[PDB]
Structure 1
Amino acid sequence: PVPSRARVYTDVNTHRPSEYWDYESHVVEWGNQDDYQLVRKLGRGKYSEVFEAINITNNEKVVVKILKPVKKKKIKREIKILENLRGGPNIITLADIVKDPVSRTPALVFEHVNNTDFKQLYQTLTDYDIRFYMYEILKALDYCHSMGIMHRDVKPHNVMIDHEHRKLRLIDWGLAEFYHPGQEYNVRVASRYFKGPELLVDYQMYDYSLDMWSLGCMLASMIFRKEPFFHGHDNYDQLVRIAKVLGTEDLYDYIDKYNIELDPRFNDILGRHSRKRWERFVHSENQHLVSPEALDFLDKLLRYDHQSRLTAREAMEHPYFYTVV
């Protein structure tokens, strides 16, 4: 395959010292978990369980993330990235790192965010609210990309919104990685519905632009009220669902530009599909969230070619955000 690199923040890690990106050599100093009392379970994941908690020394609510120590290298990676991004706009704030004295199970302590139930919010969301929150996510992505970090797991589940205080946080940096130009990454990242075509065609030399495809998937589900937008049943079928919208002509243009070898598993399922107009997804239930600006913005995110998608900074300058601060 033809090599590729990010259009932006290409050399940010190259120009920094080893301490910033060499997470395996990072010294993790675990405090005492006795300062925290667990309140309730907030969620369960493959390698973590998240709890609402109280810091007993200041009577302040926190969030405690207990990690199943399946791979130390992955825990070190998450800790280093959270330490590097600490205090960035709309990035979840790591406040402490603890180990329970008896269990010795690694746990991350974060700032508390009061998540509004999405199912309830989803119905009351306006065109303005979508633009406002999209912009908040973009601030988080432009910042972490500027810091040489790819989140690689952008999805509704990893976005927290406190609608009452119009606060948003991008969470779960467990799959995030440092971007190094020319590096070949593991394509087994992100959640099925949000995986970019680069991952599905096994093109390993991807970059920050993967996050912009995932964001495009979220934008499409939100404005069209179709969750998920690309409803694959497996990773191969996921590409077929994308091809039913973007068409197969542009897919062959993409794999040809990077000299990608399409897996034979695609041979009998891909078929032939025309390029669909974004206006075909407009219906009575969602027309109040759709506008020519939104469709033009969506069209600039949902492109096979990772290099031709808008960067987070270019996305922030799009006319769709001319109504937000």
Structure 2
Amino acid sequence: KVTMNDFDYLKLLGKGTFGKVILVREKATGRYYAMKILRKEVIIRVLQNTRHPFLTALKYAFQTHDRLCFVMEYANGGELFFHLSRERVFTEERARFYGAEIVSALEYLHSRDVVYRDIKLENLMLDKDGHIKITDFGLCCGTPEYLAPEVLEDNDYGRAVDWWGLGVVMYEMMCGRLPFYNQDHERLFELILMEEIRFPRTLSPEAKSLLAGLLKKDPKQRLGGGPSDAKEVMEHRFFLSINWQDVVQKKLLPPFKPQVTSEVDTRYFD
């Protein structure tokens, strides 16, 4: 049985309002993980069985006296946000790559009736090979939150929000900025609900089409909002050059290589 004594503490990753996430190293294998620690009283499974190439795998689950613990695989490449910062913007192809691996992960979750709710830049990390890895920690606080219109209006967390999350993630990936950066976050609520989102002229016709689809205010009209879920997204023009069987297989070549020697290389951890 796993316990607190099988790990060496290294650093905090995301903080408590619901618990903590800390970077640790399993003493026996020397491998690294992110330990989620949930306050049992501050809280006054699906996730654990959902395995997928671009989804962070749960390694261990144990309980302490008044704490819930989830030891999870920690990607070695840095957090996408870090990489996006350096490049400022990704090539539509670089974005298409990542956007493709997310769509794959989302089609899988939706197939299992699971709505992810947290598709967003900060939840994206790159693994040792440069393949995307979606996480459930909480890096960065004051980063403008971009909840789906149907969330802000009806607190509806249908599967459509994941496509919206994808849209906001793709937009910032190809536009180098959030849809409404030019405006203070105070009016962000009315904006998301009633403001048409503008796109850079440099944006390819296909890419403008994707985003406008992923970012429609009406869930039912949104790209991926129709009954065939991910099909609509997978078969959109922007993804013509995509071999879906190739992506889930990790046959595709990462547009960028992290620079880590192996999942033990404490580089990106800092």
Distance 1:227 1:315 in 2: 21
Shift of the 39–133 alpha-carbon distance from structure 1 to 2, 3 Å rule, reads same
Please name the residue that 1:225 is paired with.
176
**Are the counterparts in 2 of residues 193 and 228 from structure 1 also a CA contact under 8 Å?**
no
Please name the residue that 2:254 is paired with.
none
Please name the residue that 2:150 is paired with.
198
Question: Gapped runs of 5+ residues in structure 1?
Answer: 1-29, 74-79, 175-190, 247-275
Instruction: Return the match for 1:216 from 158, 167, 171.
Output: 167
Cα deviation 1:23-51 (Å, max 9, x = unaligned): xxxxxxx8422222222222325323222
Distance 2:179 2:13 in 1: 22
Question: Gapped runs of 5+ residues in structure 2?
Answer: 225-229, 244-270
**2:210 partner letter:** F
Distance 2:213 2:120 in 1: 18
The reply to whether residue 151 of structure 1 matches residue 116 of structure 2 is yes
Distance 1:115 1:43 in 2: 17
Q: Share of identical aligned residues, percent?
A: 28
Q: Which has the higher helix share?
A: 1
The reply to whether residue 46 of structure 1 matches residue 8 of structure 2 is no
Q: CA deviation at 1:82?
A: 1.6
**2:162 partner letter:** D
Distance 1:165 1:149 in 2: 27
Instruction: Work out the number of aligned pairs and report it.
Output: 230
Q: CA deviation at 1:141?
A: 0.9
Distance 1:308 1:128 in 2: 26
The reply to whether residue 320 of structure 1 matches residue 233 of structure 2 is no
Distance 2:60 2:210 in 1: 38
Please name the residue that 1:106 is paired with.
68
Distance 2:147 2:184 in 1: 10
Distance 1:88 1:43 in 2: 23
Q: TM-score, normalised by structure 1?
A: 0.63
Shift of the 170–45 alpha-carbon distance from structure 1 to 2, 3 Å rule, reads farther
Q: CA deviation at 1:173?
A: 8.1
Q: CA deviation at 1:127?
A: 2.4
Instruction: Return the match for 1:130 from 84, 92, 95.
Output: 95
**2:78 partner letter:** T
**Are the counterparts in 2 of residues 217 and 229 from structure 1 also a CA contact under 8 Å?**
no
Distance 1:60 1:69 in 2: 27
The reply to whether residue 291 of structure 1 matches residue 204 of structure 2 is yes
Q: CA deviation at 1:192?
A: 5.8
Matches within 5 A, 1:68-87: 68-72=39-43, 80-85=45-50, 87=51
Matches within 5 A, 1:1-325: 31-72=2-43, 80-85=45-50, 87-100=51-64, 104-117=66-79, 118-124=81-87, 125-162=90-127, 165-172=129-136, 193-201=145-153, 203-227=154-178, 229=180, 233-234=185-186, 237-245=188-196, 278=199, 281-282=200-201, 287=202, 290-311=203-224, 312-325=230-243
**1:57 partner letter:** A
**Are the counterparts in 2 of residues 293 and 319 from structure 1 also a CA contact under 8 Å?**
yes
Secondary structure in 2 matching 1:195: coil
Q: CA deviation at 1:229?
A: 4.0
Q: TM-score, normalised by structure 2?
A: 0.74
Distance 1:65 1:173 in 2: 8
Q: CA deviation at 1:54?
A: 1.4
Q: If you compute each CA radius of gyration, which structure gives the higher value, 1 or 2?
A: 1
